């Protein structure tokens, strides 16, 4: 091609959306945004295929142009806006707060949360660096830049972000015995505790995770998301608790 693509065939769409192969020839191509194309759920899919509030794309546009949908507390009017893991979707008219978390199947679940839990989200620290004028900042998995972080925050840690202010309330270090959620691979959606982090310099780190049933599995460090201490997650978990 001579430039960026703008279409997406249904057979080429992410499998976890569960799109009918004979419904049409194209799928909603997610727009650029906080989350990657293959790891995002566009708002059209969520509103039409999952919640069934809209019967087609036109009704989704009608809902969005009324400013009824908020994503992490901000009104979004783009049908293909890439909502992703740990995003909070608010529908005030229906009194609904949802958090996007994969289930054991590996698909984003329709998980309803309370307003108090909807007031915050979790972000995996992807980067920590000094910006201009020597101001430290952290970049999270959703692309948020947060300035003046706690000096203890390091990469692979999890920061609790208050959506109203976009500031760090608390954080969890990446360490053995911490509760982790799998966000990639065939173990996508499972929850467990870290047992060991195998280090290979110049290569990909491996993490061993043990679930409550004592089953152990190995995963790349990129696919691991610390969500709390064992027995004390910082977010409500979907049905199944990431077992199997």
């Amino acid at each position: 091609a001579r430039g960026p693509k703008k279409h997406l065939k249904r057979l080429a769409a992410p499998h976890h959306w569960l799109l009918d192969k004979l419904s049409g020839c194209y799928a909603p191509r997610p727009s650029a945004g906080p989350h990657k194309l293959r790891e995002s759920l566009p708002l059209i899919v969520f509103l039409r295929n999952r919640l069934k509030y809209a019967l087609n794309g036109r009704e989704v546009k009608a809902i969005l142009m009324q400013r009824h949908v908020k994503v992490d507390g901000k009104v979004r009017t783009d049908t293909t806006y890439p909502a992703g893991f740990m995003d909070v979707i608010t529908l005030d008219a229906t009194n609904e707060n949802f958090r996007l978390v994969y289930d054991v199947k590996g698909r984003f679940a329709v998980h309803r949360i309370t307003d108090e839990e909807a007031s915050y989200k979790l972000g995996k620290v992807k980067k920590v660096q000094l910006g201009k004028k020597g101001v430290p900042y952290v970049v999270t998995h959703d692309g948020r830049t947060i300035r003046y972080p706690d000096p203890n925050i390091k990469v692979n840690d999890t920061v609790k972000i208050d959506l109203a202010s976009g500031k760090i309330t608390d954080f969890i270090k990446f360490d053995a015995g911490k509760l982790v959620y799998v966000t990639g691979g065939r173990n996508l959606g499972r929850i467990g505790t870290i047992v060991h982090k195998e280090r290979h310099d110049g290569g990909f780190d491996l993490v061993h995770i043990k679930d409550s049933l004592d089953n152990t599995f190995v995963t790349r460090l990129n696919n691991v998301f610390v969500i709390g201490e064992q027995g004390k997650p910082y977010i409500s978990l979907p049905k199944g608790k990431g077992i199997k």
Binding site: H111, R112, G177, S236, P238
Partner: peptide, 23 residues
């Protein structure tokens, strides 16, 4: 010694089916 927030309560649906007969 073993080292080991609540989800929103589900709601009964607001609306139910309605039946009518005529003729």
């Amino acid at each position: 010694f073993d080292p080991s927030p609540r989800a929103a309560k589900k709601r009964r649906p607001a609306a139910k089916g309605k039946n009518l007969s005529f003729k």
